[PDB]
Swiss-Prot record:
Result after altering residue 90 to T: In HEMA; severe
Protein name: Factor VIIIa light chain
Shown chain mapped onto the complete sequence: 2192 to 2347 of 2351
Phenotype for residue 116 to A: In HEMA; moderate/mild
Known outcome of mutating residue 132 to C: In HEMA; severe/moderate; may cause reduced phospholipid binding
Domain F5/8 type C: 2-154
Designated gene of the protein: F8
Phenotype for residue 88 to C: In HEMA; severe sporadic
Disulfide bonds: 2-154
Organism: Homo sapiens (Human)
Domain of life from the UniProt record: Eukaryota
Amino acid sequence: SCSMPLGMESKAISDAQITASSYFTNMFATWSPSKARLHLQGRSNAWRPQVNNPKEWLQVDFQKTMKVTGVTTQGVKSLLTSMYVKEFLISSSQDGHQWTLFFQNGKVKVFQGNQDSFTPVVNSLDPPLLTRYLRIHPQSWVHQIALRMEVLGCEA
């Protein structure tokens, strides 16, 4: 009863609500944070950071506190090239300035992500995370960091 998609795919979460540490742009494509939407199609249809390293992150601002019970991630296949995140961390904030890593079994939880560029993977957050802001922190990837995502949950 608390697993509704919050609005990445539907665009109920607007472009302005999605930001990142950096993003990759060249003459071919512009992989801006607001392209990180589950199942999005087109030339520029995922977020990619400017460099591939675990210092990079993607942020969503719900604009109020929500109850988050899962995240869904997907990579992207750009032309003939596969790109996906294999493992990631999650951090959260109410105020947008002080952040907390999501913990499980005594330590920072390393979420197991994708195994291809096109199939979604759902990761449960238990206990649920009550938060206004979410950040995803890629830790390992195939070829390049690329993400499309959805957030699952309900009202706080």
